Write a protein that holds these residues in place. Structure first.
Motif, PDB file in Angstrom:
ATOM      1  N   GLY A 223       0.813  -1.203   0.000  1.00  0.00           N
ATOM      2  CA  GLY A 223       0.000   0.000   0.000  1.00  0.00           C
ATOM      3  C   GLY A 223       0.850   1.256   0.000  1.00  0.00           C
ATOM      4  N   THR A 224       0.294   2.359  -0.472  1.00  0.00           N
ATOM      5  CA  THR A 224       0.953   3.659  -0.304  1.00  0.00           C
ATOM      6  C   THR A 224       1.229   3.948   1.180  1.00  0.00           C
ATOM      7  N   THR A 225       0.242   3.689   2.044  1.00  0.00           N
ATOM      8  CA  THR A 225       0.372   3.967   3.478  1.00  0.00           C
ATOM      9  C   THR A 225       0.423   2.726   4.389  1.00  0.00           C
ATOM     10  N   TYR A 226      -0.299   1.666   4.052  1.00  0.00           N
ATOM     11  CA  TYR A 226      -0.360   0.474   4.883  1.00  0.00           C
ATOM     12  C   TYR A 226      -0.344  -0.742   3.981  1.00  0.00           C
ATOM     13  N   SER A 227       0.445  -1.738   4.369  1.00  0.00           N
ATOM     14  CA  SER A 227       0.570  -2.993   3.670  1.00  0.00           C
ATOM     15  C   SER A 227       0.038  -4.142   4.479  1.00  0.00           C
TER      16      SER A 227
ATOM     17  N   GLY B   4      -8.255   4.816   0.692  1.00  0.00           N
ATOM     18  CA  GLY B   4      -7.217   4.412   1.652  1.00  0.00           C
ATOM     19  C   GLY B   4      -6.743   5.555   2.512  1.00  0.00           C
ATOM     20  N   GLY B   5      -5.445   5.533   2.803  1.00  0.00           N
ATOM     21  CA  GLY B   5      -4.813   6.527   3.640  1.00  0.00           C
ATOM     22  C   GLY B   5      -4.443   7.748   2.819  1.00  0.00           C
ATOM     23  N   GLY B   6      -3.876   7.520   1.637  1.00  0.00           N
ATOM     24  CA  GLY B   6      -3.384   8.621   0.790  1.00  0.00           C
ATOM     25  C   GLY B   6      -4.093   8.812  -0.546  1.00  0.00           C
ATOM     26  N   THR B   7      -4.787   7.778  -1.026  1.00  0.00           N
ATOM     27  CA  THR B   7      -5.354   7.772  -2.383  1.00  0.00           C
ATOM     28  C   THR B   7      -6.763   7.235  -2.426  1.00  0.00           C
ATOM     29  N   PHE B   8      -7.477   7.674  -3.473  1.00  0.00           N
ATOM     30  CA  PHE B   8      -8.825   7.289  -3.771  1.00  0.00           C
ATOM     31  C   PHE B   8      -8.868   6.777  -5.186  1.00  0.00           C
TER      32      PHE B   8
ATOM     33  N   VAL C  51      -5.278  11.741  16.974  1.00  0.00           N
ATOM     34  CA  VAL C  51      -6.388  12.050  16.095  1.00  0.00           C
ATOM     35  C   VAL C  51      -6.719  10.823  15.233  1.00  0.00           C
ATOM     36  N   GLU C  52      -5.690  10.157  14.703  1.00  0.00           N
ATOM     37  CA  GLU C  52      -5.919   9.014  13.827  1.00  0.00           C
ATOM     38  C   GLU C  52      -6.606   7.898  14.614  1.00  0.00           C
ATOM     39  N   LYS C  53      -6.166   7.719  15.858  1.00  0.00           N
ATOM     40  CA  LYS C  53      -6.720   6.719  16.772  1.00  0.00           C
ATOM     41  C   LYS C  53      -8.194   6.995  17.088  1.00  0.00           C
ATOM     42  N   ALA C  54      -8.520   8.262  17.328  1.00  0.00           N
ATOM     43  CA  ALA C  54      -9.899   8.675  17.630  1.00  0.00           C
ATOM     44  C   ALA C  54     -10.806   8.524  16.420  1.00  0.00           C
ATOM     45  N   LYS C  55     -10.343   9.012  15.265  1.00  0.00           N
ATOM     46  CA  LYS C  55     -11.044   8.827  14.018  1.00  0.00           C
ATOM     47  C   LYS C  55     -11.527   7.404  13.888  1.00  0.00           C
ATOM     48  N   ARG C  56     -10.611   6.457  14.085  1.00  0.00           N
ATOM     49  CA  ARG C  56     -10.940   5.052  13.946  1.00  0.00           C
ATOM     50  C   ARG C  56     -11.989   4.625  14.971  1.00  0.00           C
TER      51      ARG C  56
ATOM     52  N   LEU D 245     -14.346   6.443  16.136  1.00  0.00           N
ATOM     53  CA  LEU D 245     -15.631   7.028  15.714  1.00  0.00           C
ATOM     54  C   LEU D 245     -16.350   6.269  14.571  1.00  0.00           C
ATOM     55  N   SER D 246     -15.670   5.312  13.953  1.00  0.00           N
ATOM     56  CA  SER D 246     -16.360   4.382  13.047  1.00  0.00           C
ATOM     57  C   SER D 246     -17.272   3.383  13.773  1.00  0.00           C
ATOM     58  N   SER D 247     -17.134   3.267  15.096  1.00  0.00           N
ATOM     59  CA  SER D 247     -17.971   2.377  15.866  1.00  0.00           C
ATOM     60  C   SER D 247     -18.501   2.947  17.207  1.00  0.00           C
TER      61      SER D 247
ATOM     62  N   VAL E  82     -13.507  -0.903  -0.630  1.00  0.00           N
ATOM     63  CA  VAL E  82     -12.131  -1.290  -0.329  1.00  0.00           C
ATOM     64  C   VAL E  82     -11.442  -0.101   0.349  1.00  0.00           C
ATOM     65  N   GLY E  83     -10.497  -0.378   1.253  1.00  0.00           N
ATOM     66  CA  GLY E  83      -9.702   0.662   1.889  1.00  0.00           C
ATOM     67  C   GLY E  83     -10.177   1.016   3.280  1.00  0.00           C
ATOM     68  N   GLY E  84      -9.228   1.347   4.148  1.00  0.00           N
ATOM     69  CA  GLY E  84      -9.515   1.589   5.568  1.00  0.00           C
ATOM     70  C   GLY E  84     -10.536   2.681   5.807  1.00  0.00           C
ATOM     71  N   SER E  85     -10.565   3.683   4.929  1.00  0.00           N
ATOM     72  CA  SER E  85     -11.448   4.812   5.094  1.00  0.00           C
ATOM     73  C   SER E  85     -12.895   4.445   4.780  1.00  0.00           C
ATOM     74  N   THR E  86     -13.130   3.333   4.075  1.00  0.00           N
ATOM     75  CA  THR E  86     -14.514   2.912   3.841  1.00  0.00           C
ATOM     76  C   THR E  86     -15.162   2.353   5.110  1.00  0.00           C
ATOM     77  N   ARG E  87     -14.399   2.242   6.199  1.00  0.00           N
ATOM     78  CA  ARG E  87     -14.982   1.916   7.503  1.00  0.00           C
ATOM     79  C   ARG E  87     -15.817   3.052   8.090  1.00  0.00           C
ATOM     80  N   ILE E  88     -15.645   4.278   7.580  1.00  0.00           N
ATOM     81  CA  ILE E  88     -16.402   5.457   8.038  1.00  0.00           C
ATOM     82  C   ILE E  88     -17.898   5.327   7.685  1.00  0.00           C
TER      83      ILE E  88
HETATM   84  N1  LIG Z   1     -12.019   2.129  11.534  1.00  0.00           N
HETATM   85  C1  LIG Z   1     -11.539   3.160  10.732  1.00  0.00           C
HETATM   86  N2  LIG Z   1     -12.223   4.298  10.608  1.00  0.00           N
HETATM   87  C2  LIG Z   1     -11.769   5.284   9.846  1.00  0.00           C
HETATM   88  N3  LIG Z   1     -10.629   5.180   9.190  1.00  0.00           N
HETATM   89  C3  LIG Z   1      -9.862   4.074   9.268  1.00  0.00           C
HETATM   90  C4  LIG Z   1     -10.310   2.990  10.052  1.00  0.00           C
HETATM   91  N4  LIG Z   1      -9.393   2.027   9.963  1.00  0.00           N
HETATM   92  C5  LIG Z   1      -8.419   2.428   9.152  1.00  0.00           C
HETATM   93  N5  LIG Z   1      -8.693   3.685   8.735  1.00  0.00           N
HETATM   94  C6  LIG Z   1      -7.874   4.553   7.825  1.00  0.00           C
HETATM   95  O1  LIG Z   1      -7.560   3.916   6.629  1.00  0.00           O
HETATM   96  C7  LIG Z   1      -6.436   4.592   6.023  1.00  0.00           C
HETATM   97  C8  LIG Z   1      -5.463   3.540   5.480  1.00  0.00           C
HETATM   98  O2  LIG Z   1      -6.139   2.765   4.473  1.00  0.00           O
HETATM   99  P1  LIG Z   1      -5.547   1.458   3.802  1.00  0.00           P
HETATM  100  O3  LIG Z   1      -5.240   0.464   4.905  1.00  0.00           O
HETATM  101  O4  LIG Z   1      -6.569   1.009   2.808  1.00  0.00           O
HETATM  102  O5  LIG Z   1      -4.214   2.080   3.128  1.00  0.00           O
HETATM  103  P2  LIG Z   1      -3.488   1.777   1.711  1.00  0.00           P
HETATM  104  O6  LIG Z   1      -3.728   0.333   1.271  1.00  0.00           O
HETATM  105  O7  LIG Z   1      -2.035   2.061   1.915  1.00  0.00           O
HETATM  106  O8  LIG Z   1      -4.236   2.854   0.809  1.00  0.00           O
HETATM  107  P3  LIG Z   1      -3.564   4.034  -0.049  1.00  0.00           P
HETATM  108  O9  LIG Z   1      -2.491   3.336  -0.840  1.00  0.00           O
HETATM  109  O10 LIG Z   1      -4.674   4.645  -0.886  1.00  0.00           O
HETATM  110  O11 LIG Z   1      -2.909   4.949   0.966  1.00  0.00           O
HETATM  111  C9  LIG Z   1      -5.827   5.466   7.114  1.00  0.00           C
HETATM  112  O12 LIG Z   1      -6.213   6.800   6.889  1.00  0.00           O
HETATM  113  C10 LIG Z   1      -6.488   4.906   8.388  1.00  0.00           C
HETATM  114  O13 LIG Z   1      -6.488   5.872   9.415  1.00  0.00           O
END
Ligand SMILES: Nc1ncnc2c1ncn2[C@@H]1O[C@H](COP(=O)(O)OP(=O)(O)OP(=O)(O)O)[C@@H](O)[C@H]1O
Length: 380
Positions: free
Chosen positions: A11-15, A199-203, A265-270, A272-274, A335-341
Motif C-alpha cells: 500500500g501507499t500507506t499500509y501494507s 485508503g490513507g493517501g489515495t482514492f 487524532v488518527e486513533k480517535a477517528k478510527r 468514531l467508526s464504531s 475497499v480501503g480503511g477509510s470505507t470503515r467510516i
Molecule cells: N475504523 C476506521 N475508521 C476510519 N478510518 C480508518 C479505520 N481504519 C483504518 N482507517 C484509515 O484507513 C487509512 C489507510 O487505508 P488502507 O489500509 O486502505 O491504506 P493503503 O492500502 O495504503 O491505501 P492508499 O495506498 O490509498 O494509501 C488510514 O487513513 C487509516 O487511518
C-alpha cells in the motif's frame, strides 16, 4: 517448488499479507500485533533501521521515508514526481534517471535508495511477518498494484520483490484482488463491478467486467491525493484553532506536539467508526500543559463533509467512460480503511439508490485476501 506462496498488498500507506493455510485465507499479524503495517522506514541516529509501526511511531523528519509508491517506477523528470517532492520532507535527488531517496542512516552517513529499494524494505518486513506465522521461509509471492500502474511501475514492484528475496510470480490489479476476495469471479454470465477504494493517501474507483471468471478493467478514476490522511488533517486544523482560542498558544511551533496530536487524532477517528464520541488526551502537550478534548461523530463528519461528497464525482466519471448507468452496476465492492467510516458507507449506498455493497471482509484486508486466494492455488 514454490513452497507456501504469500499474498501481499503493498500500500501507499499500509501494507497487508495473507496466506492460504488449512483450507482458508489467514491474514497475518506483524510482530506488534497489527494485521496491517505502515509502509514506512526510518533510520535512527544510532544507525538502527526501523520498518513499519516502529518507523512511523518514532522525531527524525528528514530521515523518515514513506510514500515510495508515489515514486516507484517513475523517472526523476516525471511531472508527477516533481510535484510530489514539493510535499515530501525527505530529500529526493536525480540518479540514474530516477528519483532516489537521500537520508542520513546514522552518525552523519548519507545513503541514497531507489524507490524500489525502499519498497523492498517494506516487502522484507511483510516476508518476516509471514515466516514468523508459518514457522518456515517463504520464497514466492503474489503482489498487488493499482489498476492504472504501467509497465515500468509493475516491473519496479517485481524488482522490489527480488531485492527482498521474493519471486513475484504474479502482479495482480488491486480492484481485481478485492473482487476475488468476495468470490465474484465465480459468477455465471456477464456482470459489471464498481470497486470504490479509499485508503490513507489515495482514492481509486474502477469499473470491472467479469465474464466466466475473467476480469477486464474497463475504466479507472479517482484522486491520487485524497484519503484518510486528509480527514486527519481537517481534525488537526480544528483542534489547533480551538487550542489557540482557549490559550492564545499556537501549537505548530513544537513539531513533536503536532506528531502526538496526529497519532491520537488518527486513533480517535478510527474509534468514531464504531462509537459516537471519542476522547483525545495528551500529557504535557505544549509548554508542560495537558490536552484533553472530545470529538463527536457528527463533528468529524461536519469537518470533512465536502471531502466525503467529492468522492462521488469520479464514480460518475467512470460510469460515463464505461457508457453505463447506475442500474447497470451488479456489484459494489468497498475497499480501503477509510470505507470503515459510516458516512462514506451511507453516501455510496445513496448514490446507488439503496443498493447494499458486498460485505464480510475487512475493507483494509480485502486486497491481500484476494492475493492470498490466488497464492493458495499457486501453492497447490
Ligand atoms: N475504523 C476506521 N475508521 C476510519 N478510518 C480508518 C479505520 N481504519 C483504518 N482507517 C484509515 O484507513 C487509512 C489507510 O487505508 P488502507 O489500509 O486502505 O491504506 P493503503 O492500502 O495504503 O491505501 P492508499 O495506498 O490509498 O494509501 C488510514 O487513513 C487509516 O487511518
Amino acid at each position: 517448488d514454490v513452497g507456501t506462496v504469500v499474498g501481499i498488498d503493498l500500500g501507499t500507506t499500509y501494507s497487508c499479507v495473507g496466506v492460504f493455510k488449512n483450507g482458508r485465507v489467514e491474514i497475518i499479524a506483524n510482530d506488534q500485533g497489527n494485521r496491517i503495517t505502515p509502509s514506512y522506514v526510518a533510520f535512527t541516529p544510532e544507525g538502527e533501521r526501523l520498518i513499519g509501526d516502529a518507523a512511523k511511531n518514532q522525531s527524525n523528519p528528514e530521515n523518515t521515508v514513506f510514500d515510495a509508491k508515489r515514486l516507484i517506477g517513475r523517472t526523476w523528470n516525471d511531472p508527477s514526481v516533481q510535484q510530489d517532492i514539493k510535499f515530501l520532507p525527505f530529500k529526493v535527488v536525480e540518479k540514474k534517471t530516477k528519483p532516489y531517496i537521500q537520508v542520513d542512516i546514522g552518525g552523519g552517513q548519507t545513503k541514497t535508495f531507489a524507490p524500489e529499494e525502499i519498497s523492498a524494505m517494506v516487502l522484507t518486513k511483510m516476508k518476516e511477518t509471514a515466516e514468523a506465522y508459518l514457522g518456515k521461509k517463504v520464497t514466492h509471492a503474489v503482489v498487488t498494484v493499482p489498476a492504472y500502474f504501467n509497465d515500468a511501475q509493475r516491473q519496479a514492484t517485481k524488482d522490489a520483490g527480488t531485492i527482498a528475496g521474493l519471486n513475484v510470480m504474479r502482479i495482480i490489479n488491486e480492484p481485481t484482488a478485492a473482487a476475488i476476495a468476495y468470490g465474484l469471479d465465480k459468477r455465471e454470465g456477464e456482470k459489471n463491478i464498481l470497486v470504490f477504494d479509499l485508503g490513507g493517501g489515495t482514492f481509486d474507483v474502477s469499473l470491472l467486467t467479469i465474464d466466466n471468471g475473467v476480469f477486464e478493467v474497463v475504466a479507472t478514476n479517482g484522486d491520487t491525493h485524497l484519503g484518510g490522511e486528509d480527514f486527519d488533517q481537517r481534525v488537526m486544523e480544528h483542534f489547533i484553532k480551538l487550542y489557540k482560542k482557549k490559550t492564545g498558544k499556537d501549537v505548530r511551533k513544537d513539531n513533536r506536539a503536532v506528531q502526538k496530536l496526529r497519532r491520537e487524532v488518527e486513533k480517535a477517528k478510527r474509534a468514531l467508526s464504531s462509537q459516537h464520541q471519542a476522547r483525545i488526551e495528551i500529557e504535557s502537550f505544549y509548554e508542560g500543559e495537558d490536552f484533553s478534548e472530545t470529538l463527536t461523530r457528527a463533528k468529524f463528519e461536519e469537518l470533512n463533509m465536502d471531502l466525503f461528497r467529492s468522492t462521488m464525482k469520479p464514480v460518475q466519471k467512470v460510469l460515463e467512460d464505461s457508457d453505463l448507468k447506475k442500474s447497470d452496476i451488479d456489484e459494489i465492492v468497498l475497499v480501503g480503511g477509510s470505507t470503515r467510516i459510516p458516512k462514506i458507507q451511507q453516501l455510496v449506498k445513496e448514490f446507488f439508490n439503496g443498493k447494499e455493497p458486498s460485505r464480510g471482509i475487512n475493507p483494509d484486508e480485502a486486497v491481500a485476501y484476494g492475493a492470498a486466494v490466488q497464492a493458495g492455488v499457486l501453492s497447490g
